[PDB]
Amino acid sequence: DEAEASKFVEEYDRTSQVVWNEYAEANWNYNTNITTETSKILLQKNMQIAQHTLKYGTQARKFDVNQLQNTTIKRIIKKVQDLERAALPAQELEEYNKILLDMETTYSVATVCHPQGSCLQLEPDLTNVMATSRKYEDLLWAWEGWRDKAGRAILQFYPKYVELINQAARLNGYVDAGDSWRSMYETPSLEQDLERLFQELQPLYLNLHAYVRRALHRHYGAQHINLEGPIPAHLLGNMWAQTWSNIYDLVVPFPSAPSMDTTEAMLKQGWTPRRMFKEADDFFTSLGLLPVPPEFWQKSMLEKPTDGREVVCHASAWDFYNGKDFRIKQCTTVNLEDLVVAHHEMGHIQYFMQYKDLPVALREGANPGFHEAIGDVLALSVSTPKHLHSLNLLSSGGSDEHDINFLMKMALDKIAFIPFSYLVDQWRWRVFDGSITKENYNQEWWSLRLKYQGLCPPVPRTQGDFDPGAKFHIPSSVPYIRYFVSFIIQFQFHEALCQAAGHTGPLHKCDIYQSKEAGQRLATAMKLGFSRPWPEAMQLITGQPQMSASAMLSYFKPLLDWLRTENELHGEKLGWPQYNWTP
Numbered sequence: 280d281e282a283e284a285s286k287f288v289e290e291y292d293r294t295s296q297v298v299w300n301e302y303a304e305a306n307w308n309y310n311t312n313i314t315t316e317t318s319k320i321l322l323q324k325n326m327q328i329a330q331h332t333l334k335y336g337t338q339a340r341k342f343d344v345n346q347l348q349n350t351t352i353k354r355i356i357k358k359v360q361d362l363e364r365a366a367l368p369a370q371e372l373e374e375y376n377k378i379l380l381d382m383e384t385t386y387s388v389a390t391v392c393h394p395q396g397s398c399l400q401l402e403p404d405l406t407n408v409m410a411t412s413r414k415y416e417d418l419l420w421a422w423e424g425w426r427d428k429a430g431r432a433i434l435q436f437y438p439k440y441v442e443l444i445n446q447a448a449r450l451n452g453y454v455d456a457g458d459s460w461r462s463m464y465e466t467p468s469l470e471q472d473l474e475r476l477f478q479e480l481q482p483l484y485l486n487l488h489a490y491v492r493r494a495l496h497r498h499y500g501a502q503h504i505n506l507e508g509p510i511p512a513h514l515l516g517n518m519w520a521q522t523w524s525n526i527y528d529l530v531v532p533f534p535s536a537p538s539m540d541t542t543e544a545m546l547k548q549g550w551t552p553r554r555m556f557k558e559a560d561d562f563f564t565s566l567g568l569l570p571v572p573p574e575f576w577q578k579s580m581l582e583k584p585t586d587g588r589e590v591v592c593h594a595s596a597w598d599f600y601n602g603k604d605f606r607i608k609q610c611t612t613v614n615l616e617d618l619v620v621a622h623h624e625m626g627h628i629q630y631f632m633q634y635k636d637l638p639v640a641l642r643e644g645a646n647p648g649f650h651e652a653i654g655d656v657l658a659l660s661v662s663t664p665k666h667l668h669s670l671n672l673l674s675s676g677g678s679d680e681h682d683i684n685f686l687m688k689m690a691l692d693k694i695a696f697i698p699f700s701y702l703v704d705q706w707r708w709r710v711f712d713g714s715i716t717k718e719n720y721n722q723e724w725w726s727l728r729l730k731y732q733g734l735c736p737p738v739p740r741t742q743g744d745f746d747p748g749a750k751f752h753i754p755s756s757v758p759y760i761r762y763f764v765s766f767i768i769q770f771q772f773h774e775a776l777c778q779a780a781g782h783t784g785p786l787h788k789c790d791i792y793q794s795k796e797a798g799q800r801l802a803t804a805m806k807l808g809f810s811r812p813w814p815e816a817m818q819l820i821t822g823q824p825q826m827s828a829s830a831m832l833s834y835f836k837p838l839l840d841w842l843r844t845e846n847e848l849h850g851e852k853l854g855w856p857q858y859n860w861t862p
């Protein structure tokens with residue numbers, strides 16, 4: 280048993296390093312160069328990695344894991360027993376691989392055209408319309424057009440995708456794909472834990488929602504906003520209304536305290552995508568954390584190519600499983616939003632670099648939420664008016680009015696995201712368990728959009744619509760609950776790191792730049808990779824083991840007080856009791 284187990288793990292690790300590296304190369308080549316040739320080569324490398332996964336997975340299942348002495352070895356073998364998609368018979372596997380490729384390509388190439396006129400891509404064109412347009416009809420054209428072209432096109436693939444991903448999950452001992460995905464957390468209480476955290480953020484979200492709804496009523500008119508109903512989904516400055524910070528101009532608490540056009544500041548000062556990533560790299564090293572290798576700068580795709588290549592523009596970070604080659608792929612735009620995204624992606628890279636010496640099976644975050652949180656933690660400090668001023672992107676600080684303005688800007692991103700990030704996998708888990716059929720995909724999506732976010736579609740949906748498909752993570756088959764987890768725990772990390780850095784005063788005023796004490800907490804946790812259950816890494820960072828909304832609540836407490844006073848004086852009804860309302 281124990282000698283065979285150790286040898287197996289050693290053999291698994293050295294062979295996986297080679298196969299995964301080769302696969303990552305082909306995957307990268309496709310993602311940064313969408314052609315028939317790179318598609319063919321990718322689909323072929325799929326079969327190579329599946330061969331390897333089957334070989335070692337079949338072998339791993341011969342071990343009685345719960346009868347093994349060593350913890351690290353037992354944990355590796357348990358994981359290898361899960362073949363994931365390689366559990367599918369050859370015919371279903373090739374079909375599944377092709378479906379995944381087809382969905383990603385469809386989404387990444389979709390355009391929205393005026394007749395006899397120009398065609399708009401999602402990045403940057405439609406994103407910019409959603410962020411900057413203040414015309415109801417122009418916002419609707421982009422919102423609907425994007426769903427018409429990307430969402431509807433995904434529908435033909437989705438039922439078969441569901442069938443095949445569920446089949447793979449069952450062949451690996453799970454009840455469905457949702458079961459398989461949730462198991463990434465190793466937390467039996469997950470669904471209830473997440474529900475409790477969501478409920479805790481309700482007073483803050485409802486108050487933000489009511490305040491923003493009033494400001495939209497002001498701008499877009501009484502005929503288009505029901506002050507007791509859900510908010511039309513196209514008015515929040517973002518394609519998915521998942522973050523609302525682009526309508527800051529419509530909702531400024533104290534318009535007498537003006538803040539700098541940060542984008543114009545970045546453009547004027549000649550900021551480029553490369554500069555944005557260099558500044559992120561500097562923040563990590565200021566903490567005593569690792570710099571990205573010279574290779575990163577050579578091989579990364581940090582901006583949309585202009586040589587005619589079709590690419591997957593959605594930001595992502597890549598581990599090539601050799602401990603040397605790490606890359607980011609991002610169609611970076613020069614603005615504050617993408618500066619935050621650059622930091623998020625550099626957090627993934629930092630995690631890769633930190634756990635690079637673990638066996639490849641353990642080269643994952645403590646849970647998927649941890650991997651998402653790292654970059655966002657640093658970005659919280661980056662976002663402070665004090666720090667932005669030090670980058671010469673803001674002029675100031677430290678009036679109460681500028682303070683509530685700052686908290687509002689942060690809430691529009693961080694608070695608004697809470698119900699959306701909770702909502703995506705509530706929908707998918709119910710698709711995977713068979714409670715939502717292909718007949719009810721869209722209707723149940725909107726039911727949840729209403730229930731959790733208090734949003735309504737600006738135009739009634741019809742048969743053939745598949746709005747979930749217009750969101751990257753759906754055709755791309757990337758689990759989403761990690762983002763909800765991330766947003767809760769990143770505030771816990773911020774609080775702990777700030778304490779470790781000797782910050783006193785309001786949490787939202789903390790900037791951990793150059794804190795070696797903060798860097799050390801992060802490094803120790805990240806080095807664990809997936810080697811221990813996640814509460815150990817939580818414990819290392821925060822001095823306790825639990826997920827908790829208390830840090831986020833504390834961060835936003837002065838804003839909650841302000842919102843309650845403001846909403847009360849205008850007599851807002853919190854929530855959307857007129858829930859059937861649409862515009």
Ligand SMILES: *[C@@H]1O[C@H](CO[C@@H]2O[C@@H](C)[C@@H](O)[C@@H](O)[C@@H]2O)[C@@H](O[C@@H]2O[C@H](CO)[C@@H](O[C@@H]3O[C@H](CO)[C@@H](O)[C@H](O[C@@H]4O[C@H](CO)[C@@H](O)[C@H](O)[C@@H]4O)[C@@H]3O)[C@H](O)[C@H]2NC(C)=O)[C@H](O)[C@H]1NC(C)=O
Nearest residue numbers: 284285286287288289290348349350351352636637638810
């Ligand atoms: C359970 O098994 C794990 C895994 O073991 C490893 O993989 C197996 C498949 C097999 O190949 C086996 O031989 C191999 O060890 C054990 O985890 C390892 O534990 C050791 C000792 O704790 C770790 O050794 C460190 O190695 C790293 C570099 O690889 C060094 O940084 C470090 O070097 C020194 O540390 C000492 C501290 O005493 C200092 O004096 C020095 O300054 C220097 O820093 C260690 O030598 C090793 O990293 C672990 N490997 C993995 C993969 O986790 C584990 O010990 C076993 N547990 C039990 C209960 O036996």
Ligand SMILES: *[C@@H]1O[C@H](CO)[C@@H](O)[C@H](O)[C@H]1NC(C)=O
Nearest residue numbers: 312313314315316317586588
């Ligand atoms: C894009 O992919 C094609 C395969 O069709 C390849 O020939 C070409 O070299 C690639 N271009 C770049 C920029 O690498």
Ligand SMILES: [Cl-]
Nearest residue numbers: 519746747749
């Ligand atoms: Cl939608």
Ligand SMILES: [Cl-]
Nearest residue numbers: 647758760761
């Ligand atoms: Cl996840």
Ligand SMILES: [Zn+2]
Nearest residue numbers: 623627650651
């Ligand atoms: Zn991420």
